[PDB]
Nucleic acid binder design. Structure first.
Ligand SMILES: [Mg+2]
Ligand SMILES: [Mg+2]
Ligand SMILES: [Mg+2]
Ligand SMILES: [Mg+2]
Ligand SMILES: [Mg+2]
Ligand SMILES: [Mg+2]
Ligand SMILES: [Mg+2]
Ligand SMILES: [Mg+2]
Ligand SMILES: [Mg+2]
Ligand SMILES: [Mg+2]
Ligand SMILES: [Mg+2]
Ligand SMILES: [Mg+2]
Ligand SMILES: [Mg+2]
Ligand SMILES: [Mg+2]
Ligand SMILES: [Mg+2]
Ligand SMILES: [Mg+2]
Ligand SMILES: [Mg+2]
Ligand SMILES: [Mg+2]
Ligand SMILES: [Mg+2]
Ligand SMILES: [Mg+2]
Ligand SMILES: [Mg+2]
Ligand SMILES: [Mg+2]
Ligand SMILES: [Mg+2]
Ligand SMILES: [Mg+2]
Ligand SMILES: [Mg+2]
Ligand SMILES: [Mg+2]
Ligand SMILES: [Mg+2]
Ligand SMILES: [Mg+2]
Ligand SMILES: [Mg+2]
Ligand SMILES: [Mg+2]
Ligand SMILES: [Mg+2]
Ligand SMILES: [Mg+2]
Ligand SMILES: [Mg+2]
Ligand SMILES: [Mg+2]
Ligand SMILES: [Mg+2]
Ligand SMILES: [Mg+2]
Ligand SMILES: [Mg+2]
Ligand SMILES: [Mg+2]
Ligand SMILES: [Mg+2]
Ligand SMILES: [Mg+2]
Ligand SMILES: [Mg+2]
Ligand SMILES: [Mg+2]
Ligand SMILES: [Mg+2]
Ligand SMILES: [Mg+2]
Ligand SMILES: [Mg+2]
Ligand SMILES: [Mg+2]
Ligand SMILES: [Mg+2]
Ligand SMILES: [Mg+2]
Ligand SMILES: [Mg+2]
Ligand SMILES: [Mg+2]
Ligand SMILES: [Mg+2]
Ligand SMILES: [Mg+2]
Ligand SMILES: [Mg+2]
Ligand SMILES: [Mg+2]
Lengths: 79, 185
RNA sequence: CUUUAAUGUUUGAUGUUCUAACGUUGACCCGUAAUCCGGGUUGCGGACAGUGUCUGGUGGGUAGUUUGACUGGGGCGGUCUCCUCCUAAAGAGUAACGGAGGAGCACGAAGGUUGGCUAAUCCUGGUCGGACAUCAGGAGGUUAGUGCAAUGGCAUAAGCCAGCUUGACUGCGAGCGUGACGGCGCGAGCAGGUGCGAAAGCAGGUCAUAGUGAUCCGGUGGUUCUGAAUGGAAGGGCCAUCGCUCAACGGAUAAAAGGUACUCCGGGGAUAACAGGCUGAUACCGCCCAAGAGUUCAUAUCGACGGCGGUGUUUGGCACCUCGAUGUCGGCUCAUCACAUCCUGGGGCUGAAGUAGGUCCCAAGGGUAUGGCUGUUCGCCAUUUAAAGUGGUACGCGAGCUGGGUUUAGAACGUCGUGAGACAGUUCGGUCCCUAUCUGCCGUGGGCGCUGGAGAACUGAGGGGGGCUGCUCCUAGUACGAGA
RNA sequence: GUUUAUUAAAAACACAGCACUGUGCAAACACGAAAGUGGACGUAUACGGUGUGACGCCUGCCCGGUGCCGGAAGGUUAAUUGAUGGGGUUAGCGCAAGCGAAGCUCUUGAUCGAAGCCCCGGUAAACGGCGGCCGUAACUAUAACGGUCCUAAGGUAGCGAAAUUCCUUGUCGGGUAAGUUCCGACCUGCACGAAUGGCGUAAUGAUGGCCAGGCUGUCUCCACCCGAGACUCAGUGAAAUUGAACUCGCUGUGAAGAUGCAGUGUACCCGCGGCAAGACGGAAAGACCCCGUGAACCUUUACUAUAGCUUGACACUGAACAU
RNA sequence: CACAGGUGGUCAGGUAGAGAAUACCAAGGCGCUUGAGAGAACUCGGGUGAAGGAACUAGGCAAAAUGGUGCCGUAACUUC
RNA sequence: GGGCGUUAAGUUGCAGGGUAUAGACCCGAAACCCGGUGAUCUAGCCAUGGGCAGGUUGAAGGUUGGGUAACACUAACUGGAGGACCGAACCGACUAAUGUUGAAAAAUUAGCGGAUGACUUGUGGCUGGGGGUGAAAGGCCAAUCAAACCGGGAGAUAGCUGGUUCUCCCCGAAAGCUAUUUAGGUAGCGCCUCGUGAAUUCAUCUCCGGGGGUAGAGCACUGUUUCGGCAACAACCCGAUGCAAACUGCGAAUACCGGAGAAUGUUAUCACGGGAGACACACGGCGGGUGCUAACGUCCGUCGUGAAGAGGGAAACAACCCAGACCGCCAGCUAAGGUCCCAAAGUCAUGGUUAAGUGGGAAACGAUGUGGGAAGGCCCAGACAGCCAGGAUGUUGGCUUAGAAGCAGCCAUCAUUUAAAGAAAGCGUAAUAGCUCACUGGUCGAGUCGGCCUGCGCGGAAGAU
RNA sequence: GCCUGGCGGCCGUAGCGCGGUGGUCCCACCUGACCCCAUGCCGAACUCAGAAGUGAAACGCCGUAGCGCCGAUGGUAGUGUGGGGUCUCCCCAUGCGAGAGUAGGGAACUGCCAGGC
């Protein structure tokens, strides 16, 4: 009849909510299909092809909101 | 072209054929007790045989008489002489806006012809319907193959077809039964 | 030597003639007072036929097998892998034969970088320019655009234009995410070499998420890895790469359709058919509002548009009970209960003169048709009756009867199929078991007990049986009525 | 006449008759690895195979598809022969790079190649097929009749609501008080039709359907009677079944239809003759239905093979000649 | 099974009869290896049934009926 | 740099757990293959013997007469044909009943078909299993046949069914995910058990740090939706009102993730290794898809119970309420639930409701049932009910209609007279008439009316042992 | 401290509209343009050399609340644990407690460097 089918898992979300151990480069947020949902900021950046919030140097996670027009923005200060 | 669109076609065509039978039945001098026979009678007025639909008026005071309530104070004479040129060809009187046309019972000879006829038209209609139903089913098969219907969906559609068919068959029966119950009364 | 010959000679292609292999189921002779067989002679045929090995065709004649799963029983229909949204209860993830769409690619630029740009739409004013081109302004503000679905995203634009380019580079990879696994994804940074830029810096393909096939068996290029005595070589390994709508998309084979009512086995009430059960949408019965018809008049009788229930009772849904068997429909025989009562009984209203009706209330005592057609139930029809009730009882009743319908095996028709066969089509034919232990009924005895033992006659707690009704007459041809 | 010994006797098989087709005799064909044998001590007025099934009048159109028959010019094609090119090795050549003869090898396949298939023609008493939209009419109508589009060609005679018609108890007539059956018609043949024969047909039939006279206990509606059981006594003496029984009704409950649970009603203990409503009574691990990567036999243009039939090459297999 | 089944050939009296049918007998052989009572429902096999006469039933199932010799006489149709 | 390694003791027996090859826990197919035994039954055929009471019909041919040119032809008689007729034996098997643990593993009884023929019968023979024979049913081939019987391969295979035997102690599941010619089977993961390691690992509560777009709400957006406003029928826009799983300019509870802390918890946690079983779940609560917000329905998320848990409660009732059974007791307190009798505990206390057996089944709607409460209108300038009387004129309003005069229907519904008086509320007439009504005046003497907030009852309420 | 420019914090009670306003300091326009460089046409923009002029435009200020925007207290919806009635809905205890709307707020605030008074 047509109605059916559907994508698979495709997790994508926050895997490093707030401050964490934040190793050399965990994930902090793999919510692909975004740029504004989560913006690359601070010691963390990367933002791979699949819009995955990288996360560089070890430390804690912040989860902020700066710059004109909301804009979440994530980063990882020292701990 | 869908199952429903098919059912509709069935109802329509079968309705047409019923109508055919309908006025076909009316096209018979019955006990003429009702205006179902005069309902047509055109009233030639204003250079046009304009039927009583927008010209004169008539009705049956009782089962044994009708009255030509001519709207025009001169049309009263129209329908009068108009009583002819038809299976009527009668000679009513002339009193007031409405004429008068008695309504008695016919002879046994016509009793024969009229009976054999009544039931005749009845069958004629039935047959027409059968053929129609048949076709309805053919189309149904085509749908089955097209709409990729399932044995259950197709058989269901078949049952429905039959339903519509029978209904009309009944209509024909009843109608024939009334025109008859009277013309045979 | 190079074209065309002539003889020669060879060697193939045919085709003729021959005899001498080989055939002879022609004739005769001997073994032999055998039709076998063998030898001999003669005739016919003759390198043919035929046979062996090899080989192309043909080959259900025979043989071995295949002919998927999901599925609100199975089948039919549909589906099977991947991407997007909702379902999904604000982490991840979640099911349905749930609600809606897409993919099996496309790009040498539609990739990289540097530099620059920013819409849709409306208003107004402008040659041909009008709904809608191009132009000027103003308003407007991601409503545009995005190679293709949907979601998220995008102005520092990923959206648009151009210059120059090849980072759609090679080797690696801290650390993560996501999978049962195979595996898939993100990835800063390092080494070598690129490109673009003045430079910081950016680039390991495209805004991202679909655009896909494991293994095996092999093909190709490279390599001094290995190479069966040694040197090579074949082959093998390693690196790069090619070949599968294996799409039933974790891919059983390189190679696979059906029939069975001629059937068979191992299992299931995990799973259909019958009947029970849950449910009551549907069905049937009832009530609510009251526009209308009823001349007048909603509610005597009926009732539009819509509304609320009751029963278990139709059509259905579910698959809980039986598949180590609960015999189907109708008839017969015998029933028993309900009341939504067909007749008879008692009433209210009446569009109830009477006689007859209509509708509602009460009432289950009793009663409630014979035939023609068909297997029917039912139904139509004939003719009766006071009436020919509706329903529950495994659609009551086969360890009680029938076996006409209906599912075995025979056969034929129409129809479908190449065909075996097939049909919720038809047609002619076609085995119906049980000695009753228990309950329960119908009868009938034997014990004991009723407080001394007997023969009788009762009382009557209770229980059962029966409960139908026509017609005629008298009242009275009166009441009533215009009469009839 | 024959048939499912043991639920089918028939409309089924057979039949005489008809037709097609194969077979020249060491026949075709069949049993058989073969020898041999049947066919037949027969020989085309014979024998085998196939279909139709006395007889009467008959047996239409289609050869596109499959099969069979003939052609076989051309295209494609087996084994066979093996051209030709390539490679491995190595004598020699060379300080080396590489090049490399001959031989041996591995590979490559020119070329030669029959039937078959394609192709050309035929063939239906061979397997088979015999029209769709719908074309133009007394109110509408309706579209049997038949235009047009396409077929290999579009059902001729005869028959038709039939052993074939779904709607269906079609419609009409007959028979009956009343007839879904029956008989005679109509034709709208879902979906007859000419040897998987069409329509008829005297006679025949334990054949299907319908009707009538006779006849009756078939029935209304059962009554009496004669015998064999049943019942009683004496002798002999089974069966299936069976977890255990101190084996009641109802209403509800409950794995959803209760002798056994709850409530309640009832009921002194035990036989004998009868009856079958229940013990989802007894009997057979349901035969229907589904399932198992179960079985069997059967079918076919499923797959893979194979006997048989058939092709060519080499061998047994030789001598000449013409081209 | 001391089983109402199956089993080939031969013989062939009397009366009646077409007859190896049939009924009664001859020669001959038997009463069938549980008996005795009773005189129930019901089952089995029979006999007779008022009036009706297929109303039965899926269906005249089963019953009842017909039944010989001679003579008279006999339709459609017909392959005579 | 990264992978795999590197200061892990191995090894050989003995006992046990598991696995592999074997029949591999035991019993069981339908079947497949190999070699033999069977034509004393039956099916065909071959050879040689036997049988068919009686009764009927009467073909061909022939003779004679007629007839013909001769033939045809004809008629008597003679003759004796036939898958010919009736009917015993003999063969067969259409119907019914009875038998059905039979007299009998197909018969008995009464009928029935053939009975000189494709007939029937005795003896012996010949065809053998994928084979035979078959007037064809898959029929028959020794009570066996869609492939005989016997022995063997053989303990075929059986992801299926059943069955699995002594005692005590401890722990204790799953009925899911993902693959699967897979779906009632398996395998990895998950959950159980056992061993060995290791940390304040893990849990609860508190506090701290997080992302969230669900509930809800809202309507800028995407759609949908009305009502008004500026459109030779209407969108756009504006204001007012709603709706949304695939709407969001807002937004919880809360779950989840991380950090710190105390207490408690026989380590509850993680890792590795020996043994598993289990991948049919069911009901109830909550959030949902689907279904009819039907089902003891179905598909998910999550929690609880049954499964795998007895005891008490709900009459009886796996799942619901309470509550987790080591054992013994003729001892106490309680939970859920109860305290008139069956039946343990109050005919308990105070105050109020109900009067229907409501309690002890059921809706829209209907009603002066009844308890309570806030309030409003009329009222001795007489309310309220009853009683007397009144209720007119233009006008029969206009139209319409046969007629429509208050009263079929449409429009209008004013004015005059007044204490009051509708161009009229119902009945009624053909239309008028006539009757009653609104209303008003008097009589009457003290209350009256219906709305609302709330408690309990009544009708609506028909089924089968 | 007044004014201005550059760079940021924070991002609507920081914005929009409307009115007023500032100048040869700074900025803005502005002049000139062969050239540096630039126009898929234009010195418009970028780019360069710089008067004359003016704050007109823009920009920056100031005022103004019409349109945004922020926004309670209270009540309402929902909801976690416990309990209760119940036709799919709701009630009670107790924690958490919106959205909208109302009151009201509101014409940003702020740091570093530089240049003018
Ligand atoms: Mg086969
Ligand atoms: Mg095999
Ligand atoms: Mg399946
Ligand atoms: Mg989620
Ligand atoms: Mg313009
Ligand atoms: Mg893309
Ligand atoms: Mg798969
Ligand atoms: Mg058969
Ligand atoms: Mg079975
Ligand atoms: Mg079940
Ligand atoms: Mg059922
Ligand atoms: Mg049951
Ligand atoms: Mg009643
Ligand atoms: Mg009847
Ligand atoms: Mg029944
Ligand atoms: Mg019986
Ligand atoms: Mg039958
Ligand atoms: Mg058959
Ligand atoms: Mg016969
Ligand atoms: Mg038989
Ligand atoms: Mg028989
Ligand atoms: Mg035939
Ligand atoms: Mg023909
Ligand atoms: Mg009759
Ligand atoms: Mg007929
Ligand atoms: Mg035919
Ligand atoms: Mg025939
Ligand atoms: Mg006895
Ligand atoms: Mg005895
Ligand atoms: Mg019960
Ligand atoms: Mg009995
Ligand atoms: Mg039983
Ligand atoms: Mg079974
Ligand atoms: Mg004896
Ligand atoms: Mg009698
Ligand atoms: Mg009868
Ligand atoms: Mg009868
Ligand atoms: Mg009889
Ligand atoms: Mg008799
Ligand atoms: Mg004979
Ligand atoms: Mg005879
Ligand atoms: Mg013999
Ligand atoms: Mg046998
Ligand atoms: Mg073996
Ligand atoms: Mg075995
Ligand atoms: Mg697979
Ligand atoms: Mg909501
Ligand atoms: Mg959640
Ligand atoms: Mg499973
Ligand atoms: Mg499961
Ligand atoms: Mg579940
Ligand atoms: Mg359930
Ligand atoms: Mg279990
Ligand atoms: Mg009650």
């Amino acid at each position: 009849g047509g109605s059916t089918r559907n994508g698979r898992d495709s997790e994508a979300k926050r895997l490093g909510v707030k401050r964490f151990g934040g190793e050399s480069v965990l994930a902090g947020s793999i919510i692909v299909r975004q740029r504004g949902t989560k913006f690359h900021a601070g010691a963390n950046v990367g933002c791979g092809r699949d819009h995955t919030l990288f996360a560089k140097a070890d430390g804690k996670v912040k989860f902020e909101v700066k710059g004109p027009k909301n804009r979440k923005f994530i980063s990882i200060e020292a701990e | 072209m869908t199952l429903k669109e098919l059912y509709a076609e069935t109802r329509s065509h079968m309705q047409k054929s019923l109508e055919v039978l309908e006025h076909n039945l009316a096209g018979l001098r019955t006990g003429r007790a009702n205006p179902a026979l005069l309902l047509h009678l055109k009233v030639e007025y204003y250079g046009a045989h304009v039927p009583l639909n927008q010209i004169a008026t008539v009705t049956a005071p009782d089962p044994r008489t009708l009255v030509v309530q001519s709207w025009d104070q001169n049309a009263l004479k129209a329908i009068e002489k108009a009583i002819r040129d038809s299976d009527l060809g009668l000679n009513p009187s002339n009193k007031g806006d409405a004429l008068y046309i008695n309504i008695p019972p016919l002879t046994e000879e016509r009793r024969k012809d009229l009976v054999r006829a009544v039931r005749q038209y009845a069958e004629e209609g039935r047959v027409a319907i059968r053929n129609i139903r048949r076709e309805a089913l053919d189309k149904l098969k085509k749908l089955a193959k097209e709409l990729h219907l399932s044995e259950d969906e197709t058989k269901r559609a078949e049952a429905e077809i039959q339903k519509i068919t029978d209904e009309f068959i009944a209509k024909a029966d009843q109608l024939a039964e009334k025109k008859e119950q009277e013309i045979l009364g």
